[PDB]
């Protein structure tokens, strides 16, 4: 019916998808090894849209996880949520990889394991006779997720041409350049494949993570154990129309169709306010829907590093405001009434704009059926500031003679560096041209 195959790949893409499947059992009322609660069918009306359909009421995840590093998968099998995963769909015990840290490693390893990489991931494709598409849950940081992920964006474009492609890709961190220095090279090589060899992306910045991780979360030493908490909730938040019973844009080709203006303009800004557990003691007094979307357009919950004074000459075109759970829908048109009076979104002068709001009932659970949740999927034309940030860090590195002799020994014979530079400037010029 609407079966999606997630493509978890890389050192960071496997960990953000590990707790994504772990989030799904707590809201479906199911255990990874059994069914102890009856809340799975009376409370939740649809479960076989991301999981594989049941053979013994055991909803297998439709997931594949490949990585060169064996460290990310050795921290999985000792956890009690790995018995839900199957040891025959992806790998058996003692799976390995390369050495290995290179963008050209996984780019060259795709055609030597070409027979095996297109054998076991295609067995899940013909399980349903109407496949939705493929989401590449991969990473941009490092050479593991960026090297091999650029290969599958090409060969799955023609072997599966009538399928939706859209990824939840995480952006790397640009604070210092000591541990990694190959960061401007492997990022722009995948970013070219994300626009012409891929339809849509969902950007997730790393410098904007610790802006939120010290905002309300109150940590002193930033660890990697907090990167899975902001990411796994908004992943399950994006499929609330798709997993839980909704009516309009209840498919993944429903939501993405109403937000993309044009190809190579698909970078969607994400926002998510409620992350604090001591808000729970004051939501008993009928906290309404009239105050939760006034702060979405206000740049506080954003996960995109952008300029603060660059929003006057940029214009919103498509903005999504997803409320979940208890909505009190007699005032949801009242919340959309107050949008035109502030004009917090700059509107495009050539065409109409749209503020789309939708709702779906959440899990039968006490932290879910009590507190209001707001998921934002914006589309603003100030996203070229990240593309100006990555390009200015790209041409400055090529004048310092950095990784021009250390990178072209394997499988690179011609200069494909300006092939990425002009196509990035094509994106940056067509964005500002789009508001005439």
């Amino acid at each position: 019916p609407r079966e999606i195959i997630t493509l978890q790949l890389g050192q960071c893409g496997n960990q953000i998808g590990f707790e994504f499947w772990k989030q799904l059992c707590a809201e479906h009322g199911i255990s990874p090894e059994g069914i102890v609660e009856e809340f799975a069918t009376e409370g939740t009306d649809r479960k076989d849209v991301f999981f594989y359909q049941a053979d013994d009421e055991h909803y297998i995840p439709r997931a594949v996880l490949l990585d060169l590093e064996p460290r990310v998968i050795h921290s999985i099998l000792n956890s009690p949520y790995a018995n839900l995963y199957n040891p025959e769909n992806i790998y058996l015990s003692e799976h390995g990889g390369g050495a290995g840290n290179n963008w050209a490693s996984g780019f060259s390893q795709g055609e030597k394991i070409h027979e095996d990489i297109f054998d076991i991931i295609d067995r899940e494709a013909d399980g349903s006779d109407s496949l939705e598409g493929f989401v590449l849950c991969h990473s941009i940081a490092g050479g593991t997720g960026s090297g091999l992920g650029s290969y599958l964006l090409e060969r799955l474009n023609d072997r599966y041409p009538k399928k939706l492609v859209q990824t939840y890709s995480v952006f790397p961190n640009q604070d210092e350049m000591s541990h990694v220095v190959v960061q401007p090279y492997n990022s722009l090589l995948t970013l070219k494949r994300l626009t012409q060899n891929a339809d849509c992306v969902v950007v997730l910045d790393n410098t904007a993570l610790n802006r939120i991780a010290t905002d309300r979360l109150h940590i002193q030493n930033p660890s990697f154990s907090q990167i899975n908490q902001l990411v796994s909730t908004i992943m399950s938040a994006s499929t609330t129309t798709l997993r839980y019973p909704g009516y309009m844009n209840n498919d993944l080709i429903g939501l993405i169709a109403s937000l993309i203006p044009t190809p190579r303009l698909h970078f969607l800004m994400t926002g998510y306010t409620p992350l604090t557990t001591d808000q729970s003691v004051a939501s008993v007094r009928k906290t309404t829907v009239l105050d939760v979307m006034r702060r979405l357009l206000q740049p506080k919950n954003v996960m995109v590093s952008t300029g603060r004074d660059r929003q006057t000459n940029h214009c919103y075109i498509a903005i999504l405001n997803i409320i979940q759970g208890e909505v009190d829908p007699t005032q949801v048109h009242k919340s959309l009434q107050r949008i035109r009076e502030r004009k917090l979104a700059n509107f495009i002068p050539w065409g109409p704009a749209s503020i789309q709001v939708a709702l779906s009932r959440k899990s039968p659970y006490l932290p879910s059926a009590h507190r209001v949740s707001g998921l934002m999927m914006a589309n603003h034309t100030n996203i070229s500031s990240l593309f100006e940030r990555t390009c200015r860090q790209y041409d400055k590195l090529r004048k310092r003679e950095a990784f021009l002799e250390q990178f072209r020994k394997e499988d690179i014979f011609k200069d494909n560096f300006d092939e990425l530079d002009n196509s990035r400037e094509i994106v940056q010029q067509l964005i500002d041209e789009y508001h005439a």
Partner: protein, 60 residues
Amino acid sequence: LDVLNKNYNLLEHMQAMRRYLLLGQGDFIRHLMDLLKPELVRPATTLYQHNLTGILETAV
């Protein structure tokens, strides 16, 4: 009002008709309307009804 609740579920059918005629829950109708389109593109014949009864039954 108690005899319907024990035997007939009268006002439960008030909610159940909203999911099909008012199209409350869309997954019942979208998994319908996906399969239902390769039959609606051709003109209807006298051979129309017999596969429409179980294109419903594979959808439900």
